[PDB]
Structure formats: C-alpha cells, structure tokens
Design a protein around this ligand. Structure first.
Ligand code: NAD
Ligand code: NA
Ligand code: NA
Ligand code: NA
Ligand code: NA
Lengths: 493, 495, 495, 493
C-alpha cells in the first residue's frame, strides 16, 4: 500500500450539475468533520429543493430523444465507464486517503477494499452496457413482437455514508450502463469523495447532465428527489425507517419506481462441526468490519451449545486484540464511528444491553478522549427479545446467542422483520443445503461472510428492502420495457 | 362460428368469501348487491368482506406458504400441471363463465366467449409452461467461491383487480403468482365479483392446496385497503385507477414495505400517418377506442390524424360510430353493451358535457341510448385540442377524441405530453416512420398497424403514471420472484 | 400402488412406415421380425424401410416445412397445445404402451409404467411449455441500426434412436424439435420399433399436420445411413454407440454439412468416499449399474470405493446382486428382465469371459440365468483395475466393476482417465469434497449422493467421446434453432 | 489516419507455443508475398503435425485443473482481454500497415475498419468473461440441480486470409472470455499480423500455453488440428469445400465439436421503391469491399425491372470510378487480390461469365503489370444457372440479375446451397418484414449491407456453415455444460 497523505487537499465541495460546480441557491453550507479528531475538514454547499430542481432539469434535458447520451452507442457507454474506472485508479491513493479522512475507516482498507471494489464494480458494469438484450417474442397471430430494454430516465439515487465511494459505484454502474441519467444525493457525513469522482466523470467525457450530484441533508435534498414530479425512479440505500419515508413520498407524488436497500440484523450461524478458528475470525469480521457500520453485519452470532464456551472465549480474545486507533496508521484495525450522533446512539445501545441482562464480556465504553472511538464490545448470553438482539446498532457491538438444534436456529434466525443477509458455518453438505434454502435472507454465505462480488446480486427480504443491486439483476430496476407489436403480412416460424 | 348459445340467466353458485378452500360469510354477516348493468336489477347478494376477513385470508395464505408445506414442497412442474388443470376446468365451463361474465359486467357475450375466456385460457396455459423454467443463475464470482441465485417466491401476494375484464384480470394475476409458487389473497371488484368466485371453486376442484388462493369480495377502502396495509402481506399487485395507485403505494410504505407493482390509467395516442391504409386505420381506430364499452386503460382515446387525411378520417369514423350497435349483450348483433354501473354512467355523461362546453365538436352520439340499464350512445368529438379535459383525462367510456396534426416531430411531442404512458399506436406503410415513432413514443406498448393486440407472451404495463412493472410474458414473473444469492466457500475454484 | 394390471399379450396395431400421416409398406415390400426377448419368439413383422422410403419421408417433411405451410404459420403456443394433446393421448394409452414397451424391449412392466412412460409424459409436457418462450434478442448494436435475432427452426431433422429406452428416446427427440417448429424423419431401432409406431398414430390423432413427423423403421446401415447422408436433411441428432457416432459425423461432412448432435457411450465412474452413508451408497450403486438390465450409457460401471470401506462395500454389493430377481418382466417382483437380443446376450457373456481371463475377481453371477430368452445373471467383479477391458469398454449389461482407491487426487485422475465423459457421481457427507469433485470430474452430469436422477428441466449429454450437444432442459432447444440476425437501418437510434 | 510506414519491419515469423517462438521441427519455411508487388516479404516457419502436437500438449497443460488459467477469476480474463486490446491500440498504426503489406487491402481501411473492429470485438468479449451464467434449475424431487458453464478445453481455430486480424479476434474473444485454451492455424497468405499479436498476448500477461499459433499450410497443420485426438473442439472459417474436410476429420478422429463459417453467394435485393443512390452505393460496397474477398459479399444483385436500367447505369459508372492502386496511397479504393492462385481463378470466372452469355458491362481484365490487380468487373443480364451466378468468385466481379415480383425473388434468392447473408432495399414496412422472414440466410440486412457489430451474431444457413460467431451466441460453441444434481434433505420453492 502506498504511504497515505494524512491531510489530502480537498478540491470539490459544491453541487455538480451539467458538469459545472455550483453553490446552493441559498449560498448555505454545512461542515463535514474528520471523525478521528472531531474537527471540521471544510464547508460543503448545502443543496435543497431548488438545487434538486436544477439537477432534475439538467438530467431531463440530457435524456431528451436525440441527445448525445440517448444516441451514444451502448458500447461507448461501456468505454466511458471503463475510462472512469481508469481515472479512479490513477487517483486511487488520493481517493483512499480522502475516504479515510472524511469517513474514519482505516486507510489500508480504503485502499485495498473500497477502492478495489469500486474499480471492479464499474468495470463489471462497463461490460453490461451493450449486452442487456430485449427479446423477440413469438406472439400469436400475424405479428412481429419484441421488447426494447430502454432506460427508465431520470434516476434519483440516495446513498449513505458507510461506504461512500462504493455506494456511489453500486448506483452509477448499472444506471449508466443502461443509459439512464442520475441525480445523486450523497450523505452529509461523507460528501467529499463522491464530489471528487464527479470531477472525474467530467474528465472521462460523460455528457453534461448525465450525472448530477447534490450534497445536502436527507429531509431537504433527499426528500426533494423522492417527491419530485419529474424523477422517473428512485434508488435508496439507508435505514429502514427512511425507506418508509421514501416509498410514501414516491406514492404521494408521481408513482416513480422505487428500489430500497435497507437495514439488517443478520444471523451468523455456527454449527458445532464448523472449523473453529475460521468461524471465530469470520464472525469477528462479520460484525466488526467497517466499525460495525454495515447493514450486512453479522449482528446475531448464533453458536451451537457444544462449541459455545470455546467460541466465546476465542471471540473475546480476538475483540480484545483488535487495534483501535488513528486510521492512517497501518496497525489500526478499527477507526472511529462516523459522527457524534452515531457515537452516542451506540453507547446508548451498549447501556441497554447491560440493563436487559446480556453479559458484557469485553469493551462497553469510549476508547479515546478525542474523535468518536468505541471499544470493541462483546455481549454473551443474548436472548431474542433484547433490544441489542432486535435493533440494528451499526457499531462495534457483537451479540452471541446460544442454540441447540437446526430447526430451532432456523426459526430464531427468521424471527426478524429484517432479511438482508445470513450465514452458516458447517462442514456438512446437507446442513448447508437445508439452511441456505430455509433462511429468509437475500444473501446466504456458507463458510464465509461479507463476500461481495460485482457478479452476484445483493438486497433484502422483508423490511431490508426490495430489488437487487450488483450482478445482471442490478440492471432490472434501471430498465423500462417497451413492447413493440407490428402487424406483418404472414407470420412464419 | 363456434360461439355456443348462451344461457341468458346463468345460475349463481358462489357468492361468499373463499378462504382455505372453504366458503364463508363475512365476519360481520353483511352482504352487498351486484347488479346486472343491462337492466339495473340486482343479480344477488355477495358477502361483504372487510379487514377481519382479510386477516383470516392472510393467515390461511401464510400457513400454506410455511417451509415444508405441500405447496412449498411441490415440484415446479406440478405447479404447471395444476395451472393446466385449472385451464381445462375453465374450458369445460367456458359457456357458463362467458354468460356469467356478461351478466355481471355487461360486455357482449360473443366477446366474453371469444376474447375474455380465450385469453384467460391462453394466459393460464402460457404461465403453466413457465412454472419449471424461470431459472436462477450460477455466477462466476471472484475468489474461491461457488455463487448462485435461487428464484424463490416472494410469499403472500395481495392482488387487487378491477371490473373491466374480471376473469382476464384474475388470470393475469394468478398465472405468474402460482407459476412461481406464491400464495394469494385476491380482492375482486365489487361491481363484478361473481365469475372470479366461480373460478375459486374450480381452483379447489383442480387440487390446489388449501390457502394457496383466497378471494375476498368487498369494497375498496375496506377490504382492498386492509390488504395494502397488512403487516403480513409480502407483495401487492394492483390494477386500477392512477388515483388509487397512489393510495396503494402509500399504504405499502406506511406499513411493512411490501413490494408493489401497479397497472394504472391511460390516455393512449393512436397516430394515423397520411400514408396509412385508410380503411384499416379507420376500423382499427374505432376498435381502439370503443372496445369493451370504452372501459380499457389501453383505449386509443387520443386519435391523432395527419392533416392531409383528417377530413376523410373523421367522416368515415363518424359513419362507423353511427353504425355501432348498442343493445342487449346476449344478442350476437350487439357491439356495445351497457357501462358497468350508475357511477360510471354518470361520470361518462359528465365528460360528454365537459367536452361540449370546452369547445370540442360533437359529431355524433352524446346522450343516453336506452331508458333502462346504463347505455350510452357511441360518441365522437372532432377538432379536439390538447388542453381540453376530454383530451387529458381518462373517460373510460365510448367517447372518441380526434385531433389533427401536421408533422412527425409535432405528433411525437403531443403524444408524449401526458403523465400517462400505457400504450400507443402508429399507422403507416413506411419502415422508417414506424421504426422512429416506435422508439420515440413514451409508452409501454407501441402497436404498429394494429391496436389492442395482446398475447400472454408479450409484456404489458405503464411508463410514467400508468404504472410500474410488467404483466404477461417472462417479465410478469419478476414481481413474484425473490432472488436469493448463496455464496459458498470452496476448496479451489476452477472454470 | 398405482401400477394398473398389464395385458401380457398387447395387440400390435402399427407395424408399417409412417409418412405424411399415412401408413405404408416399404417400397421393396420387405419386412423384418421383431422378437420378444423374454421368449425369443417373433412378435410380428415390421416394414423394412430403406433409402427409397427415407427419400419419401424427407420429401413429405420438406413439404410440411415450406414457408406458408400450416406448420410454419401455426402459433408457437399452438405447437405447445399439440404437444400437450399428444401427452394426454399417451397418458390415455399408458397401460397399453407400457406393456408393449416391455413386450418388445424386455424391461420390467412396473418400470415401463412408472419410469419410462412417466418420463415421456413429463418430457413432452415440459417441452410444450417451451414452444412459445425461446426468445430471440434485441441487440444494441453500434450505429443507427435496429438489430435483432429470430429463433427459427432448422428444418428437416433426421433423428436416429436406440432400443434401450424406445419411447423415452423418442420423446427426448420429438419434444424440443416440435416445440421449436421443426419437422422430423425418425429412424427407430430395429429391436424395438413397435411403441414408437403406435405413438405415430397418436401424433396423427393429436392433429399434427401431415409430414411434421415421419417414422421409418428399418436397419441402421440402410435407413439410418440414408438419413445421415441425405442431401435435403438439415440436421441429424443421433443417440447410440460411439462407433456409429463417428459414421454419422462423417456422413454429415461428406454430404451436405447438416448440423450434428450426438449422445454416445459411457464408462461412468461412481465414487464412494469413506464418509458416505454406506447403506444408501450400496443401494444407489446397485441401481446405478443394474438399472434397465445394465443397458444405459448413464450406467455407473466403474464403482470406485475408498479403501477404508472397500471390503464392506463389496460384501454388501455382492449380497444385493445375489438378491436381485431375474424373471418374466410382467411379474411385478422382477427387477431384471432379459437383454434386448441375442447379439447383446452373446456380447455381454463375452465381456464376462474377458473379465475372468484378465484377472478380475468374479464374486457372483457370470452365467446364463434361464434356458429361454436372453437372461444373464447379475454379475459382480471385484478388485477391478483400470487397464482391464471390463474397466475401459462399455459392456451394456448387468456386469458391475468395483475398484479400490485411496485419495481424492488419485480418484479424480482415474475417473477422468477415459475417452468417455457422459456421467459421474460422488457419495460423501462433506460439503467441500462434494464441491471439489463436482468441479473436477469431466462428465456432462455429476450426481451427488444420488444416481440416475433425470429431469426434463436439466440437460444431459457427453464430454469427450460421449457426444456433443445437450438434450433436456432449455439447452435441448439450441440444436433445433437456426439463429437469424436482422439488421435494419433506422433514421436515428436512441437508447 | 496517421501516415503509414510502407515497409514496416517484421519481428515475428515463427511458431508460438508456451509464449515462446520456435522454428518448425523440420526447420522448413514458406514465403509470404506482398500481393502489391509479387515480391517475398519474408520466410515463415512452416508448422506441420509435429508442431501442432507440441501446441496441443502446451494447451492441454495450461487447461489442467488447478492451473493459473483454470483458477483465474473470470473478471480477470476480461481484464487481460482489455489489456490485449489496449496493446493492439498502442500498435494500431504498425499493425494496420503490416496488415496492408501482407494482405493487400488499402491501409486506410486496415486502420479505420479492420483495426477498429478488432478492438471492438476484444473489448466486447472482455465484458462477457464474467457474465455467461449457468442456471439453477427447479428439477422434480428432493434435489438441487444446476449447470456450470465450463470451457470446452483445447480449441483448434483455423482462419482464412481475407481479414487476418479480425478473424483472429472473432476466434480469440469468445474462446478466451470463457476460459478455453487455443491452438490457432493462421492462413499461409497472411500469417504476419497474427504472429505479432501473439507477442502482444505474451506482453498482456496471458499464461503460457493459453494461446498457441502454428503458421503453416492447410492440409498439413490445419488437418493435424482437425484430426487431433486431444483437441476438444474445432472452429473453422474458410471455404465450404474445406469445411467438409474438417467435419470428416472430426468425425473420423475423436468426435470433437465443430463449428464452421463457410462460403456464400449472398443475394442483395433492390426493390423498385428503394432509395436509388443509397442502394447503388451499398450494392457496390456489398460486392467490391475488400477486393471482393468476403464470404458475406452481395454477389447476386437482384434488381426489380422498373429500376433495372438506371440501377445498372449507375452501378457501371461507380465501378468505372473505383480507384485501383497502391494500397498505401490514400486515394486507393481497391488493392490487389491476395495471391496468384486467386488472381488466376478470378480471371477464369470472368471468362466463364463471358462464355455463358452474361453481358460484360465494364472491366474484365488485369489492371496492372505487377502484383495481382483486377479491374472492377460488372456483369449484366445474369441468369441463375450461370457459373458466376452459382459459385463463389471471391473477387471484384459483380452479378446483376433482373426480377419482377417479390414471390419470384424469394424463390431465386433461396435457390442456393449457400445461406450466409442477404439484404433487402425497400421503403416499405411490409416488404421488409416479409422478405427478412422468408430469406434463408444467417444475416439479413435491411437498407444496408455489411453492417457488423460485435453484439450481433453472424453465421450460415445450409452449406454456409453451422454455429454463430459474435454476440452472446459466439460463447455457446466454447461452453461445455455440466449438470450437477445434488440430493437435498427437503426441497422447497
Ligand atoms: N463464413 C465466414 O464468416 C467466412 C469469413 C471469411 C472467409 N470465409 C471463406 O474464406 C475462405 C478463405 O479463403 P480460402 O479460399 O483460402 O479458404 P480455405 O478454406 O482454403 O482456407 C481457409 C483456412 O483453412 C486452411 N485449410 C486449407 N485446406 C485445409 C485442410 N485440408 N484442412 C485444414 N485446414 C485447411 C487454410 O490454410 C486456411 O488457414 C473463402 O473461400 C471464403 O469461402 C468465410
Ligand atoms: Na466526515
Ligand atoms: Na355487476
Ligand atoms: Na424386440
Ligand atoms: Na501475403
């Protein structure tokens, strides 16, 4: 890993519309903080409804029949996505450092995980741009019938702060591969890296108005997108509570199409025949990755009785060894939480765990006197009705639950309004097949956790959301299907 | 001609709530009348299902969907066999069901038999074939993993349908849902409950496990709303008005974030270029608008005609509308039966009044066609302009709007200047005009030299406020599929 | 148990050449006997089709395929309906056809009824569902063009099939060919012509247009060769021996470059790891080899067993083979009927003799089981080694080879050290062993903890000299599809 | 277009195996000629059976389970294809000049058409490498059944001289995208550009043995590949007569899988309502492109009676204007034919046309005293039984036939043992739909000709071959389908 610049310069802090940079109409700004220190990095333009309106107008113009973007060869959309990826790779060291600065995650992880996954996502989707065929369809009668896979049009895309660049890429790849135009609302905690990437979108040669980015708050700019009468589709990643708000805003306005990637309380099931230390280390990763700030987090670790004591002992030792510190130090495993709001809320959940009778095995408090650092925390003897067992914590707080039978753990795993992900650790073919079929989750990992690939789709069951991102499936939400049915003189096979 | 003679007074056998392969009164014991629109007389009372009935239906559907249940364990091919058996039973009872359809809805019996029932049979048979063919994927993910997707059912599917094509809308919903192994709670329209309840009896006869299909007749803001807001319904599919579409999507968001697909209203443009075949275009434009008493969101309700042929097109269209026979729908000479109910009757008369007052030229019809039932004269307005109410709002009756245009660029902009986008058509002999217009129109279906050409193979649904999602075709399965990725660590991935 | 009682002397109704929905003698007026293998007696004479008969059949098929013909114009969904009607007719006549199958081929009636006929019905019904679902594509080519593909039929398809599963091999061929709108000239095996000719009668009854399916019984180097070399056959599909596969592919190349798919021989490995469920593995290994009198290219004819369990596996396998009932195939207690003919009888006895002489341990059987018909004792060889003839060559009879191995790396190399590659299986409780072996084996089907699990949904066919192409599944349509790209200049391409 | 080097240096003239360069075992060589001058460019290693054997052994080793190529991520195969394309683009000016030197086609066309299409083909297929999914299949019973899309293994690929680099790319793109290994036999007339590209395959980082190239003759090296007992699959592009030989060699050996892209006598149908000058110019291109050396050539130009005289007059004027000359001169439209054999054979066909009663309207003779240049030749009043109407000429010899009705022209167009391509020129929707359905051809162009895209498949009906190249379809011939059917405890939907 190239040595980081621990104070990367910030070049882009405004609203991006028609490949130009704007202040907000109000000229208001908001601070973004470095969570390692609690100090302001810079001010950022505070986009609201009137800024969103400009962005939507720009997007709609760029989507007009006969525009450069509408007429461009699909293969050329792919070329432009590949060019974007090459520019990100050129600027990989900078972007990883800026990602760490704004978000808090370790720089080694920003570089080797986030930036790698961004490159792979964009390059994957570049390949789709000229391959998502419609159909020729052997309808009854003397007709030629076929489908066109058109773009849906103006796509509102609202993303969170936990993986700023990667969440941007998961949205832009499929939308652009299929010829949509975008109005993106980046998270107020972490706007900077996506704004830099907008500069690279301009540099790559995307036509103006194809990607517009409005930094600002959720109930102002975000809600303006979800409520807008000329936005055709919204994709939202965030909390389940806000997903409700989005779907109500869509239905209340123009019945735009909605996909949602929401919260989780994902069960990680360790059968007694698992490989012990692999299970312990994967369970540790499953929960603590990215400071616990993952909707995918394995935050109910179900451990079979016969291995429970050993598994717990090992898990506690591993949590106690996990290095919390400055995210630019290569020894650091865990940076701060993103902001003070999250910091306080996680400490609040920890206090609920103690009060409700879970066993605090390690951690439980603040880890530093500056920035938002929380000790890696492990609770044992967790039970299904506890707050920490039910609600998404989004911090470094692990729940270990004991179970006896496979039928029992299916029922407890599934007894959630969430269904984003799950995992099973076992050597047994039959247990793996049974559990992967039975679990009500959009991704089931077997003998692994948090294995993402641009090829394989991701998304929720139940209140974890609707639709899928990544893979071929990621294109469906960005496609408007048009049937053309043509009278012909004489149909033949 | 193969249309068998109808019973004009088909007996009603089924008029209750259908839950777990059982027939029940409403919890309240209330009933509501359904009326024969040809006479205004009550056919029979039907159980008035409400929230408590919907709750029982959802519990029965949930029980049928439990892991390990007969419906969950059944071979996909066997789901196909069940769909084909249901189709056979409907075919057995085709003459009866077509007559019952006409009795309760008002459409001509010949059309109930040759269109509605034929399309029901073809839709169920088409989807039977999908049951064991909607594959998931094996995916060559990076690293030492085997990754694949399972195409699972979503679960408990609430399905709310309108009165315009009672049996066909039932089949568009049941076919993909059942093919993919979902379970159903269906709320049929209060104006047309009877044929769908008969089909429930045939579902039971076919051997579908109890609870797989449940039907709750009742009103919209009671039973329909209870489905849309229910905390244990995983998915809702709604076909109806754009206005109630907004209610459904808000209910979904405000309750449990159930998945939502919508098939809503239209104001579809039918574009006649000056090189069209005139005779063919005139008759197809007539069909496009007047089919099913005008009660189709598909309807070609903005007939755009190029100025060089406009006068002749209008004269020929008026002639044809004057010749269109309004009558008892059991008479095979009848082309147009009554509108479905008194509310619709009055609304359409209201739109006709608006049309006259806002400056459209009334060229024929415009009034009541009979002193009993809900019959309206075929009505043609000429010199219609884009800003008129009758050019913007869906009338849902036998009221035709003819507009004049000059150029292709003009007519693309005018046709697309709507919040609706369900369908469109272009009539032209030219290859290049056909290709350009079919690309340019913002509509979910574009017909070329035809109109109202539906096939179970080809998807249908809206752009813009005409809805979200597609019915029919392979696409119709997407809304009923929950995709699960399974990603397995392996010892050594090889190609 | 739902197996209906058989007629042990089913009447033969159809014994001629089937062309254009007509029954004909051979041009030569020659006939050939088909024999009941249970008794060695002639059932009846069958018309002996040759080149001149094949020429008439091909002309009838070509006429049925002409542009504008009823079969070319027919709706794809209607091709589906015809396939479903044929299935219904076969189901109507299931008891008869299962008995006739057993009479002519020798397999147990219970298996003819519950396996062969069930699978025929499921195959035709599966493919009926594909008829209107094998979409071409709309393709976003560079430039101002609209490009798409049509999935057309190839045309006149020559289909040559063996005697081991007469009706099922007929259905594997007809299902995809007819679903995609091809026409067929089929050459059935001379040992088992009768059931396929009956099914021709049902094809006619179902309403397929004349000439769409034509059947020529006769010999291989006469009628079969005439099909493979014919200048007006567009495609041949052959299932049979690897040796005749080479003849077919050479004939195709030497005549008109017709398209060729082949389903050939096997020497499939069945690998029992030491953590297998022993009782289950023993019974499945027994089935794997002995199913259908050993007459299956699918057969698990190299049973590899890990050394820690080898002795017990062998003792239990011998016990089971000693218990396997050989008898009249109409007796429901019979597990093994006769071999199909005297040539096969002698060949298998020859392989048994080779096995003994080349050092394999004869553990049971090895001889003739009855003094009439072609019955062979279930035969088990232990301590089989890779270089033995009985470990390399396909025996096609009730002769089981058990080999010992130690390691996974070893058994992958040994299993793959064959020019065959049709199927394979692994028995293990471990996830990682199952995944690794399923990736590593060079076989078109790998079964895990099972054997001989066929479904119309899942493709089947060879690696290496076991053949080219796949039957069953969506994949089975590929060989019957001619892809046409249509690329149209348009005024202005938009996304 | 960058100015060409009219004498580019030749770096690579040997057999390429395991990313190394070898003489033939025999140490024999063969000359490759510059067809513009008839002079030898250089000697090339003359590969035969023993060289093929080495190549097949190298390919088989590279395909072993657990090899680098077998274990590489599919996405990484795509990266390597993209890297290959970038290296070709780096060396585009050189490769276009070498292509012209060896083959004869104009340098402007080598640069703007061949090299562009090579880049686009490789970049298209790079995108497929991680997207050609197998299936999960809802079989009856308590089983999990799925397909793996494996590679077929060792793929013999035999290509012609008419589009040397492009034919290489049409073969390598799909084979490598799907993880096969290759033994390629390049045409003896034009070996040089493909050998240079092998050097770029090494430079790109493909593992040794993944691509092996054996220059040499057809009945020696080509036949050795088609007959080889350890080649799993052969793809052959060439003449129909040799396609027969290939299929016989496959059936006579190991029953390898065979696809064939063979000859043509493609009908180009001009209806009376066509746009005249567009039809004339497209018909001219259709026949004369690439010195007539295209199996796709529109070599039966069917012209409706009412436009025949004008169409012919215009076609003759255009042929008389077509500039024959040095292919490095930017004014040159037509270079020489590839070799003396072709030169003589084309002159022989011209003499048959004269003798059988076709009307020679222009050309008909040699166009220069050095190199293999033939005048653009147009025959009128051609009839269906004439040699020039039936047989593939593969030179600048145009056939114009007159017809009256659409039913007549369908029957005459289809009355051929060839079926590679066809076209219709018309304004009429119904005529276009009828003819495109009725014509027995693998590609039907409407109001265009020779419109190729990597997205859209190409290949023959009848004796024009089997299988398709380009598009998703191009992957099918390179995929070995494996069904895995696994007993499970309890199947659920
Ligand atoms: N359908 C298509 O896509 C397509 C494309 C380009 C060219 N073509 C055909 O290209 C041909 C190329 O020129 P050609 O006339 O020299 O073709 P050809 O068939 O003689 O040669 C084609 C290739 O096959 C090799 N070959 C020749 N004899 C062989 C044999 N006995 N065994 C194995 N390989 C052998 C040649 O060396 C060369 O590499 C044209 O005749 C045309 O018919 C077809
Ligand atoms: Na920040
Ligand atoms: Na009614
Ligand atoms: Na027999
Ligand atoms: Na040369």
């Amino acid at each position: 890993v190239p040595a980081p610049n621990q104070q990367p310069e910030v070049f882009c802090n405004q609203i991006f519309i028609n490949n130009e940079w704007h202040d907000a109409v109000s000229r208001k700004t908001f601070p973004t903080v470095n969570p390692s220190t609690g100090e302001v990095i810079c001010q950022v333009a505070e986009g609201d409804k009137e800024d969103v309106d400009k962005a939507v107008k720009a997007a709609r113009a760029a989507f007009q029949l006969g525009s450069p973007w509408r007429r461009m060869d699909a293969s050329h959309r792919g070329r432009l996505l590949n060019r974007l990826a090459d520019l990100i790779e050129r600027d990989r060291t900078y972007l990883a450092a800026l990602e760490t600065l704004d978000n808090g995650k370790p720089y080694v992880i920003s570089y080797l995980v986030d930036l790698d996954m961004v490159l792979k996502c964009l390059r994957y989707y570049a390949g789709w741009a000229d391959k998502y065929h419609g159909k020729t369809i052997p309808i009854d009668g003397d007709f030629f019938s076929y489908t066109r896979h058109e773009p849906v049009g103006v796509c509102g895309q609202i993303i969170p702060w936990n993986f700023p660049l990667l969440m941007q890429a998961w949205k832009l790849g499929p939308a652009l591969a299929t010829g949509n135009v975008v109005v993106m609302k980046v998270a107020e905690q972490t706007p900077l890296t996506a704004l830099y990437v907008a500069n690279l979108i301009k540099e790559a040669g995307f036509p103006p108005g194809v990607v517009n980015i409005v930094p600002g708050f959720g109930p102002t700019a975000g809600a303006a997108i979800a409520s807008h009468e000329d936005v055709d589709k919204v994709a939202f990643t965030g909390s389940t509570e806000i997903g409700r708000v989005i779907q109500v805003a869509a239905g209340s306005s123009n019945l735009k199409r909605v996909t949602l990637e929401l919260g989780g309380k994902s069960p990680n099931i360790i059968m007694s025949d698992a490989d012990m230390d692999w299970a312990v280390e994967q369970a540790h990763f499953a929960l603590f990755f990215n400071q616990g700030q993952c909707s995918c987090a394995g935050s109910r670790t179900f451990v079979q009785e016969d291995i429970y004591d050993e598994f717990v002992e090992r898990s506690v030792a591993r949590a106690k060894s996990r290095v919390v510190g400055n995210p630019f130090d290569s020894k650091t495993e865990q940076g701060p939480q993103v902001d003070e709001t999250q910091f306080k809320k996680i400490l609040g959940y920890i206090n609920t765990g103690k009060q409700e009778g879970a066993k605090l095995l390690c951690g439980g408090g603040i880890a530093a006197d500056r920035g938002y650092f929380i000790q890696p925390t492990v609770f044992g003897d967790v039970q299904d009705g506890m707050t920490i067992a039910k609600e998404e914590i989004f911090g470094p707080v692990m729940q270990i639950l004991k179970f006896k039978t496979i039928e029992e753990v299916v029922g407890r795993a599934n007894n959630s309004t969430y269904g984003l992900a799950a995992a099973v650790f076992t050597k047994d073919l039959d247990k793996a097949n049974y559990l992967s079929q039975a679990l009500q989750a959009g991704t089931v990992w077997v003998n692994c956790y948090d294995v993402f690939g641009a090829q394989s789709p991701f998304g929720g069951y139940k209140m974890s959301g609707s639709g899928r991102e990544l893979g071929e499936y990621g294109l469906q939400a960005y496609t408007e299907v048009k049937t053309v049915t043509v009278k012909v003189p004489q149909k033949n096979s």
